[PDB]
């Protein structure tokens, strides 16, 4: 398989701030990656897939970029609703594989 590892199990920020998360690929995945939003006690939603492109209906403050083995998921402006666990995916080949998860921290 091909392992997608995320650097930070936790990150802290506050409202209005800007935070960006990475993802690291076991080998070259080309541009195929996806980022997920799992709110506490909820089915994880799709946000951004295949490097920059974002799924229909995702608000514009959610952005992502990268290529090759090094990826990034950028939040322009943090809000309250933004607290949840994030995951990065590899759809480059079968079987698909998910990252370890990343949880935001809003410190007031």
């Amino acid at each position: 398989d091909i392992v997608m590892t995320q650097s930070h199990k936790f990150m802290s920020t506050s409202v209005g701030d800007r935070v960006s998360i990475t993802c690291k690929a076991s080998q070259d995945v080309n541009t195929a990656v996806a980022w997920y939003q799992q709110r506490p006690g909820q089915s994880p939603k799709l946000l951004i897939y295949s490097a920059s492109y974002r799924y229909t209906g995702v608000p514009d403050r959610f952005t992502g970029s990268g290529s090759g083995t090094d990826f990034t998921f950028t939040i322009s402006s943090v809000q309250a609703e933004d607290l949840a666990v994030y995951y990065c995916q590899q759809h480059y080949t079968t079987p698909h594989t998910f990252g370890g998860g990343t949880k935001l921290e809003i410190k007031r």
Partner: protein, 119 residues
Amino acid sequence: EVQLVESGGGLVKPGGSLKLSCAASGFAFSTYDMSWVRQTPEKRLELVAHISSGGGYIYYPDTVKGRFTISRDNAKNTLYLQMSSLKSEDTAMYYCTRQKGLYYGFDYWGQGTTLTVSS
């Protein structure tokens, strides 16, 4: 709009078999590939099974390979998962998802149902 519901999940003892059934409404159900995803208690997510839109292609990961079976019926708008020989690590909550192809990201996710393997 769209509804993905599932059933059958619940406590079971090792070795048993259980049929998780997913039902969908609000879209044309023969035009989308489908899949199952289970979330371990550590929240580590992993794939379970995959089927093509019209039943052409069916993919299993190496761990569950041969132990499970997946099938769908375009007439009943259902997605069935037949799974047996449950070991310890087979406990997690199972989501019923939807895709437009192999490599597209999963857009929808069922509310999910738990499964538990214990004495």
